[PDB]
Motif scaffolding. Structure first.
Motif, PDB file in Angstrom:
ATOM      1  N   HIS A   1      48.573  93.189  48.926  1.00 18.04           N
ATOM      2  CA  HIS A   1      47.853  93.953  49.939  1.00 18.04           C
ATOM      3  C   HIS A   1      48.436  93.719  51.329  1.00 18.04           C
ATOM      4  N   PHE A   2      48.773  92.465  51.647  1.00 12.68           N
ATOM      5  CA  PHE A   2      49.437  92.172  52.913  1.00 12.68           C
ATOM      6  C   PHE A   2      50.802  92.845  52.988  1.00 12.68           C
ATOM      7  N   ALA A   3      51.538  92.855  51.875  1.00 13.09           N
ATOM      8  CA  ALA A   3      52.835  93.522  51.857  1.00 13.09           C
ATOM      9  C   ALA A   3      52.689  95.024  52.067  1.00 13.09           C
ATOM     10  N   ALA A   4      51.654  95.628  51.480  1.00 14.76           N
ATOM     11  CA  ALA A   4      51.396  97.045  51.707  1.00 14.76           C
ATOM     12  C   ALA A   4      51.062  97.315  53.167  1.00 14.76           C
ATOM     13  N   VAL A   5      50.266  96.439  53.781  1.00 17.38           N
ATOM     14  CA  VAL A   5      49.970  96.582  55.204  1.00 17.38           C
ATOM     15  C   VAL A   5      51.251  96.501  56.025  1.00 17.38           C
ATOM     16  N   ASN A   6      52.132  95.558  55.687  1.00 18.54           N
ATOM     17  CA  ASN A   6      53.393  95.425  56.412  1.00 18.54           C
ATOM     18  C   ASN A   6      54.271  96.659  56.242  1.00 18.54           C
ATOM     19  N   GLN A   7      54.325  97.211  55.030  1.00 21.77           N
ATOM     20  CA  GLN A   7      55.141  98.388  54.762  1.00 21.77           C
ATOM     21  C   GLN A   7      54.521  99.674  55.289  1.00 21.77           C
ATOM     22  N   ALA A   8      53.246  99.652  55.679  1.00 17.35           N
ATOM     23  CA  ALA A   8      52.639 100.846  56.253  1.00 17.35           C
ATOM     24  C   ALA A   8      53.186 101.148  57.644  1.00 17.35           C
TER      25      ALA A   8
ATOM     26  N   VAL B   1      53.898 106.429  70.723  1.00 17.36           N
ATOM     27  CA  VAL B   1      53.475 105.061  71.018  1.00 17.36           C
ATOM     28  C   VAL B   1      52.011 104.860  70.635  1.00 17.36           C
ATOM     29  N   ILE B   2      51.174 105.862  70.908  1.00 17.76           N
ATOM     30  CA  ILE B   2      49.756 105.781  70.568  1.00 17.76           C
ATOM     31  C   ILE B   2      49.568 105.707  69.060  1.00 17.76           C
ATOM     32  N   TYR B   3      50.339 106.493  68.306  1.00 19.41           N
ATOM     33  CA  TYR B   3      50.258 106.440  66.849  1.00 19.41           C
ATOM     34  C   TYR B   3      50.669 105.071  66.331  1.00 19.41           C
ATOM     35  N   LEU B   4      51.718 104.490  66.914  1.00 20.01           N
ATOM     36  CA  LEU B   4      52.115 103.138  66.536  1.00 20.01           C
ATOM     37  C   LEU B   4      50.982 102.147  66.779  1.00 20.01           C
ATOM     38  N   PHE B   5      50.365 102.217  67.961  1.00 23.98           N
ATOM     39  CA  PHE B   5      49.281 101.293  68.288  1.00 23.98           C
ATOM     40  C   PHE B   5      48.081 101.488  67.371  1.00 23.98           C
ATOM     41  N   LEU B   6      47.727 102.742  67.085  1.00 22.58           N
ATOM     42  CA  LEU B   6      46.595 103.020  66.206  1.00 22.58           C
ATOM     43  C   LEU B   6      46.859 102.524  64.792  1.00 22.58           C
ATOM     44  N   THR B   7      48.074 102.736  64.283  1.00 19.61           N
ATOM     45  CA  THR B   7      48.414 102.222  62.964  1.00 19.61           C
ATOM     46  C   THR B   7      48.306 100.707  62.931  1.00 19.61           C
ATOM     47  N   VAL B   8      48.812 100.038  63.971  1.00 14.77           N
ATOM     48  CA  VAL B   8      48.718  98.583  64.026  1.00 14.77           C
ATOM     49  C   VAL B   8      47.261  98.141  64.044  1.00 14.77           C
ATOM     50  N   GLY B   9      46.427  98.813  64.839  1.00 18.15           N
ATOM     51  CA  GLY B   9      45.029  98.419  64.929  1.00 18.15           C
ATOM     52  C   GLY B   9      44.278  98.599  63.623  1.00 18.15           C
ATOM     53  N   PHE B  10      44.451  99.756  62.981  1.00 18.75           N
ATOM     54  CA  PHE B  10      43.758 100.005  61.720  1.00 18.75           C
ATOM     55  C   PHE B  10      44.240  99.063  60.623  1.00 18.75           C
ATOM     56  N   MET B  11      45.551  98.835  60.533  1.00 16.69           N
ATOM     57  CA  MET B  11      46.046  97.932  59.504  1.00 16.69           C
ATOM     58  C   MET B  11      45.659  96.488  59.790  1.00 16.69           C
ATOM     59  N   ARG B  12      45.484  96.118  61.060  1.00 18.03           N
ATOM     60  CA  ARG B  12      44.980  94.783  61.360  1.00 18.03           C
ATOM     61  C   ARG B  12      43.502  94.659  61.023  1.00 18.03           C
ATOM     62  N   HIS B  13      42.734  95.740  61.176  1.00 22.26           N
ATOM     63  CA  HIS B  13      41.360  95.736  60.681  1.00 22.26           C
ATOM     64  C   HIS B  13      41.328  95.530  59.170  1.00 22.26           C
ATOM     65  N   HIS B  14      42.199  96.231  58.444  1.00 16.81           N
ATOM     66  CA  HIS B  14      42.263  96.047  56.997  1.00 16.81           C
ATOM     67  C   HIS B  14      42.692  94.627  56.636  1.00 16.81           C
ATOM     68  N   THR B  15      43.651  94.071  57.376  1.00 13.72           N
ATOM     69  CA  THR B  15      44.090  92.703  57.128  1.00 13.72           C
ATOM     70  C   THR B  15      42.969  91.707  57.390  1.00 13.72           C
ATOM     71  N   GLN B  16      42.170  91.942  58.432  1.00 16.25           N
ATOM     72  CA  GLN B  16      41.008  91.096  58.680  1.00 16.25           C
ATOM     73  C   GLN B  16      40.013  91.193  57.533  1.00 16.25           C
ATOM     74  N   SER B  17      39.835  92.395  56.984  1.00 15.06           N
ATOM     75  CA  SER B  17      38.980  92.548  55.811  1.00 15.06           C
ATOM     76  C   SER B  17      39.509  91.740  54.631  1.00 15.06           C
ATOM     77  N   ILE B  18      40.823  91.776  54.409  1.00 20.53           N
ATOM     78  CA  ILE B  18      41.414  91.031  53.299  1.00 20.53           C
ATOM     79  C   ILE B  18      41.255  89.529  53.504  1.00 20.53           C
ATOM     80  N   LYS B  19      41.480  89.053  54.730  1.00 22.65           N
ATOM     81  CA  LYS B  19      41.510  87.617  54.987  1.00 22.65           C
ATOM     82  C   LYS B  19      40.149  86.971  54.762  1.00 22.65           C
TER      83      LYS B  19
END
Length: 650
Positions: free
Chosen positions: A586-593, A131-149
């Protein structure tokens, strides 16, 4: 092996191969017609250009898509650092604190989730860490998505790409419609699209012939004499005078070629106005009114008719937000309607039919053995070509299957480069996640066998294939796979051996020295985002899926991602001309991560089902987390693919 699951010997072999590949690249980089720096021609200089390249330099020399790609890789690096810390410092001691397997100190099985008893009440730690790995992946990929946006907000885009126009429209009529139906918008200019593909090709050939002509004129005037050439494939060699290959004047030959190019150019200029493409590039004076029209068309049909509506078939239009002029593929922009779709359903359906039964190299080879294909080789040929030909065949099949899935998307026409890369990423990642991870983990060999075992419903004496996942040989197999991808894979990506072979073939099959220069200045091509994202995501998915089951794959995954980040920082600058794609891949890659934490949860749910059984607390908790994280992600995909229909998005 008697050692740590073959990891020491295989790691030594892979690092030796990596060092040899680095040596070969350092030798050939500038000697093989500047192949290692081919984009720059369109004390290790290559090794120090990845630790000294700033992000502002990359943003200029490689585009913002390379910046997004490298930021994604850096986020994955940080995520894998945190994952390696958590695994190696908590899960690995917990797994080692078990007696279910052999007490050999140099044993890989001791470092797996299979070393713990079902009644140890400590697999809750593994589930919590999933569960922690899931949350960490979501957080890091949302940071990357914020960078993209933050780089996705402006885009300085005002042009809208409209398709579905009748092959009788004019700029005057299109402008009249956009003025009569939307008085608040200022239209800059309407650019109707014609079948300018052969014309562009002939223009490029004329420019190349012009460069060859000026080369052979400057050389002639400086040397005081002309130059002899032999126009024939592989005609530079064989200096002996033979019929067929004759040495003829270069100036006259290139002048004749330029004259023929000019006649074809003017003929295609005459003939290109008679083939309208039924498209238009309408650019507005403001992104505000461009988005207003986009909401009018694609967000709900078209609830505003005009005087020039029936003559344009306004209800049949498909207004998009257009793309960069250099990412539009005019060569295959001429296929529309029922075509490109008959071709899609003839290419991808055939690929699906083939792969559904021959997904893996194991099943491909076993089919050949059953059909007596390897019988002539294995009749009597001494032990060597008997124990080495099957393994040589399996590696070849791996490469070829990934490559065929790739080319079915180098095909498919795919009007835009951004559209080509996104579908390519999806198709290659989905195929790799089954060829590499899921089927070998479950012990299956094809999607047909996978679905036959599933029955599309939980039935019969199943849950026995769900033991090949947790054996202390599947974990070591994927650890060695990650090691190979870390060193052999990245070394081969740096070396680019098939590309080098094709480049050498093109160079040797060149008419003249000028012909050998146009090849060098055109060898470099745009970086294949999507194609590289799928491989990176596949290896990341392996790492995350086996990060808890065997907490030894994590450091090697970190090493892999570090080496891949280095290799991609090198390749985006010295090779691989900058690409201008839409910021959707890039958003699709974030989703597929997120498929990697999803599959980690799947692995832990399989373990809980095997040991604690269904309806157990840990099993139900893992199943609920899996269902929630899939429904949230599945609804996140049905949101993106249907976002433009929402008037709020506009």
């Amino acid at each position: 092996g008697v050692t740590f699951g073959g990891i020491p010997t295989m790691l030594l072999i892979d690092v030796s191969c990596f060092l040899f590949l680095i040596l070969v690249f350092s030798i050939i980089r500038r000697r093989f017609w500047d192949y290692g720096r081919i984009a720059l021609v369109s004390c290790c200089p290559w090794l120090t250009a990845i630790f000294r390249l700033h992000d502002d330099q990359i943003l200029e020399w490689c585009g913002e898509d390379a910046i997004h790609y490298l930021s994604f890789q850096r986020h994955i690096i940080f995520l894998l650092v945190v994952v390696s810390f958590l695994s190696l410092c908590v899960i690995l001691p917990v797994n080692l604190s078990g007696d279910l397997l052999d007490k050999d100190p140099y044993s890989f099985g001791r470092t797996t989730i299979a070393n713990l008893q079902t009644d140890n009440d400590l697999l809750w730690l593994h589930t919590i860490f999933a569960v922690i790995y899931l949350f960490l992946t979501v957080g890091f990929m949302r940071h990357h998505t914020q960078s993209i946006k933050y780089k996705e907000e402006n885009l300085v885009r005002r042009t809208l790409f409209i398709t579905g126009l009748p092959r009788d429209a004019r700029k005057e009529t299109v402008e009249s419609h956009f003025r009569d139906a939307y008085p608040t918008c200022e239209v800059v200019d309407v650019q109707l699209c014609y079948n300018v593909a052969k014309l562009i090709y002939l223009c490029k050939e004329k420019k190349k012939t012009e460069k060859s002509l000026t080369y052979y004129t400057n050389l002639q005037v400086k040397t005081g004499q002309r130059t002899l050439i032999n126009p024939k494939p592989c005609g530079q060699f064989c200096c002996c005078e033979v019929l067929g290959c004759e040495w003829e004047d270069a100036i006259s030959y290139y002048t004749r070629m330029k004259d023929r190019l000019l006649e074809r150019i003017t003929e295609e200029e005459r003939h290109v106005q008679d083939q309208p493409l039924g498209m238009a590039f309408v650019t507005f004076q403001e992104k505000s009114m461009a988005t207003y029209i986009l909401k009018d068309f694609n967000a709900c049909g078209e609830p505003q008719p005009s005087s020039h509506s029936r003559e344009l078939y306004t209800s049949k239009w498909t207004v998009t937000f257009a793309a960069d002029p250099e990412d539009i593929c005019w060569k295959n922009l001429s296929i529309q309607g029922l075509r490109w779709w008959l071709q899609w359903l003839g290419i991808n359906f055939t690929l699906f039919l083939g792969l559904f039964f021959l997904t893996t190299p194991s099943i491909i080879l076993s089919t050949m053995d059953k059909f007596n294909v390897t019988k002539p080789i294995h009749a009597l040929n001494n032990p060597i070509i008997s124990q080495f030909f099957p393994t040589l065949l399996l590696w070849s099949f791996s490469a070829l299957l990934p490559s065929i899935v790739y080319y079915s998307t180098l095909l498919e026409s795919h009007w835009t480069k951004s559209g080509e890369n996104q579908i390519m990423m999806t198709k290659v990642y989905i195929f790799l996640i089954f060829m590499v991870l899921i089927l070998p983990s479950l012990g299956l060999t094809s999607l047909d066998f996978f679905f036959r075992w599933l029955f599309d419903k939980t039935s019969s004496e199943a849950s026995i294939r769900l033991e090949c996942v947790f054996l202390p040989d599947q974990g070591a197999f994927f650890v060695n796979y990650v090691i190979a991808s870390a060193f052999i894979g990245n070394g081969m990506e740096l070396l680019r051996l098939p590309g080098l072979i094709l480049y050498t073939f093109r160079m040797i099959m060149a008419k003249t020295a000028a012909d050998r220069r146009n090849v060098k200045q055109n060898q470099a091509f745009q970086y294949e985002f999507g194609a590289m994202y799928a491989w990176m995501l596949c290896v990341f998915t392996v790492i995350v899926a086996y990060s808890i089951t065997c907490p030894i794959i994590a450091p090697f995954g970190l090493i892999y991602i570090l080496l891949k980040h280095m290799v991609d920082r090198h390749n985006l600058y010295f090779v691989y001309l900058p690409a201008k794609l839409e910021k959707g891949i890039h958003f699709a890659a974030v989703n597929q991560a997120l498929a990697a934490p999803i599959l980690c949860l799947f692995w832990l749910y399989f373990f809980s089902f095997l040991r604690l059984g269904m309806k157990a607390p840990a099993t139900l908790f893992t199943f609920l987390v899996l269902l929630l994280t899939i429904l949230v992600c599945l609804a996140h995909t049905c949101f993106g693919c249907f976002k433009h229909l929402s008037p709020l998005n506009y």
